[PDB]
Design a protein around this ligand. Structure first.
Ligand SMILES: *[C@@H]1O[C@H](CO[C@@H]2O[C@@H](C)[C@@H](O)[C@@H](O)[C@@H]2O)[C@@H](O[C@@H]2O[C@H](CO)[C@@H](O[C@@H]3O[C@H](CO[C@H]4O[C@H](CO)[C@@H](O)[C@H](O)[C@@H]4O[C@@H]4O[C@H](CO)[C@@H](O)[C@H](O)[C@H]4NC(C)=O)[C@@H](O)[C@H](O[C@H]4O[C@H](CO)[C@@H](O)[C@H](O)[C@@H]4O[C@@H]4O[C@H](CO)[C@@H](O)[C@H](O)[C@H]4NC(C)=O)[C@@H]3O)[C@H](O)[C@H]2NC(C)=O)[C@H](O)[C@H]1NC(C)=O
Lengths: 207, 205
């Protein structure tokens, strides 16, 4: 019948105390003639009742989609506490139990190296800046680009890749005009990982 | 009941006439107490006989997958021909279709990047290869040093870039010593839009 998916909190939400993290239980393909679902959240076995059910959606399919959100404590997720979502539906015989938690294992603090473009690239109106982030565990991490305080435009970050030493790495590419590189402006790679100091580090790249 | 999954040839196979590209019609969940199955391969609607079965009759946990392999022409795959597998305890035969990713091909650019001066500290540094603005995602990237292909490199998946193009990076991990000597390390990239479907970019201290 209906399928159930559990989505962990965004890394940036857990690494900054100022921000609000939350585990998300999304159950889809719930039948049109069975609107009533029943969530049961469990933090390390202990059932909690501070969750909140977002408003539901009707699709072209006509199969309704119900989402329940539980706000968590940053340290509780950082401590690797298990979160278990139990979805109960009138169509299914047995409720669907799902479980999500922080990736288990000895954490490693990422090293971050900024790499300038190549001469061969210079010929072009738009050159690329590279940020190498390697040797981090787990895969949870958030990387951004900025210049002179405000966020930078046109960057993409590649997914985490499993490396030889059992750790992850990634590369982030920021596309800027040849001018802004030759004009002497200074850009910055902001890396946010839990094993870092204050869950934050920053490397400045410039001509 | 039974599921039919079809997979394209490896990108490296089609970019070299020397190698042999194959289209793979993997049938899973065959069932048990019935292991029978029939295959009908089609190229642009026109059926072709020359497909070889490999695994043979099911024996497994519920099933052992029964698979059919087609050998195809390099340029025929490069000229966007559509390949269709027709698998026939089933009311209607399952038909799957696959072909080269449609779109406009773009000539990749390759830029090799030395390690940071921050990285020297470690006796195991990293070399980088940036492949930018290619399409489709079907691409090959390998690392080389003086003819001999040493592999201590990891390659990130192709990522959809803003301008609709694909890109990726590649990281070769070597001892600092080799970089200190002044050795040369080449990035090999293979893409259909490229010249001779191949390009090389050397990097050295
Ligand atoms: C009827 O329609 C609905 C709704 O679809 C919408 O309407 C229809 C009419 C069309 O117009 C659609 O185009 C339109 O979108 C269909 O609903 C879909 O159902 C499928 C399953 O059949 C779901 O697939 C799952 O997707 C998740 C990833 O989902 C995120 O990303 C999507 C884009 O990529 C996005 O659309 C989703 O909303 C969702 O977005 C995330 O949202 C969270 C929470 O809000 C947010 O915080 C995130 O940032 C955001 N992410 C992004 C990228 O935007 C995927 O994870 C699922 O994969 C798991 O399950 C598979 C088996 O089902 C398995 O093969 C996968 O490998 C994977 O398995 C998991 O893997 C992890 C790690 O390896 C592991 O830890 C887990 O244990 C394992 N899971 C288990 C236990 O199995 C899966 O692919 C769609 O999300 C869902 N769409 C939406 C929009 O909700 C419906 O199918 C239609 N029904 C019929 C009968 O046709």
């Amino acid at each position: 019948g209906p399928s159930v998916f559990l989505f962990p909190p965004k890394p940036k939400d857990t690494l900054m105390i100022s921000r609000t993290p939350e585990v998300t239980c999304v159950v889809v393909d719930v039948s049109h003639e069975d609107p009533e679902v029943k969530f049961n959240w469990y933090v390390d076995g202990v059932e909690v009742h501070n969750a909140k059910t977002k408003p539901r959606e009707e699709f072209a399919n006509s199969t309704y989609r119900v989402v329940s959100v539980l706000t968590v404590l940053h340290q509780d997720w950082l401590n690797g506490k298990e979160y278990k979502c139990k979805v109960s539906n009138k169509a299914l015989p047995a409720p669907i139990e799902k479980t999500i938690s922080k990736a288990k294992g000895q954490p490693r603090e990422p090293q971050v190296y900024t790499l300038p473009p190549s001469r061969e690239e210079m010929t072009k109106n738009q050159v690329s800046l590279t940020c190498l982030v390697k040797g981090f565990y787990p895969s949870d991490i958030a990387v951004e680009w900025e210049s002179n305080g405000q966020p930078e435009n046109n960057y993409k970050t590649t997914p985490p890749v499993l490396d030889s030493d059992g750790s992850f790495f990634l590369y982030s590419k920021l596309t800027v005009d040849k001018s802004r590189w030759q004009q002497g402006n200074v850009f910055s790679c902001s890396v946010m990982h839990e094993a870092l100091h204050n869950h934050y580090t920053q490397k400045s790249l410039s001509l």
